[PDB]
């Protein structure tokens, strides 16, 4: 839960950065369905097989 | 950290221009680690700079 900060840089313009992290610190990621990816990567195999 | 297994980011401090060209003030802003590069050729731990 990052929070924006406003830092002024000379006349008429601002620089934005992370000011503080609310809550606890954790890790970003990507989740993918497991058996669907397994099936998909085997399905790519049955088509890719023919030119190898 | 004792290998916290969650990237901590680096909390940095630097000088910025206030509403007058001549007076300056200390500021701080958390930055993601990959964008921050150490500066010294020696083994200094204190000072850093942006990757650009």
């Amino acid at each position: 839960n990052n929070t924006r900060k406003s830092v002024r840089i000379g006349p008429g313009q601002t620089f934005y950065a992370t000011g503080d992290i609310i809550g606890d610190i954790k890790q970003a990621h990507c989740n993918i369905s497991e058996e669907k990816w397994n099936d998909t990567l085997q399905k790519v195999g049955i088509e890719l097989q023919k030119h190898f | 950290v004792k290998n916290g297994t969650v990237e901590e980011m680096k909390n940095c401090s630097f000088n910025t221009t206030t509403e007058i060209r001549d007076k300056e003030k200390k500021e701080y802003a958390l930055f993601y680690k990959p964008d921050i590069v150490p500066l010294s050729e020696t083994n200094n731990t204190s000072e850093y700079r942006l990757i650009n």
Partner: antibody, heavy 126, light 110 residues
């Protein structure tokens, strides 16, 4: 069997800082959030803060920020509750409780899922 | 003092049903499903009772229940017993990252 234990009944005098110690017995102290709860004697519960042992990161409630700061030492299975500039309005029992499960992902820091409680200590000041 | 409002006592006899109104607003109760109830016997440590709107731990019976309603979620007891004549305190997440309590609800069973 898992159990939460604390230092017994406490005696001080007003103004002095207090350091309440909480023992994590019979489970992984690295895998669960810990939460502190105040109970004024015979009154309702007031919430203080939490501590993450594996991370060491903490947050004290806005009512006590800059006055309460928790710490731990895994080698002795101890969680601490620091509390400075003690007013006599802090007359209360302090509890140590086991919160949600820690994960590298997900965020159970703020979940009210207090499973077990420590036997507490009544602080004597007036 | 609690930001959450909640009654201080509802009285009666065994076997009844109850509704005790822990109340919040958009910031704590409305936006989130993080609401809980805690039993508090006289002079005893609190006991977790209801967690995450309505789920129950072990050592806890189907004599008790609860459910969300907008900015108020309530404790619904059923089949009252004098043994459970305790205090009851609601509890809920309140944004930022904080935990809040409410009320003083002493059950009474004649």
């Amino acid at each position: 069997q898992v159990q939460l234990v604390q230092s017994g009944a406490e005696v001080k005098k007003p103004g002095a800082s207090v350091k309440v110690s909480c023992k994590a017995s019979g489970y992984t102290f690295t895998d669960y959030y810990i939460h502190w709860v105040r109970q004024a004697p015979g009154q309702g519960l007031e919430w203080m803060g939490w501590i993450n042992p594996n991370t060491g990161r903490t947050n004290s409630a806005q009512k006590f920020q800059g006055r309460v700061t928790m710490t731990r030492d895994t080698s002795i299975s101890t969680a601490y509750m620091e509390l400075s500039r003690l007013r006599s309005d802090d007359t209360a029992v302090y509890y140590c409780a086991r919160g949600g499960w820690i994960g590298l992902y997900y965020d159970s820091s703020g979940y009210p899922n207090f499973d077990y409680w420590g036997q507490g200590t009544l602080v004597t000041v007036s | 003092q609690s930001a959450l409002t909640q009654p201080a006592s509802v009285s009666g006899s065994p076997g009844q049903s109850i509704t005790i109104s822990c109340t919040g607003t958009s910031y704590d109760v409305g936006s989130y499903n993080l609401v809980s109830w805690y039993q508090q016997h006289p002079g005893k440590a609190p006991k977790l009772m209801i967690y995450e709107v309505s789920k129950r731990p072990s050592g806890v019976s189907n004599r008790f229940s609860g459910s969300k309603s907008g900015n108020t979620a309530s404790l619904t007891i059923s089949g009252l017993q004098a043994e459970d004549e305790a205090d009851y305190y609601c509890c809920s997440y309140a944004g930022s990252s904080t935990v809040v309590f409410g009320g003083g609800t002493k059950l009474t069973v004649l």
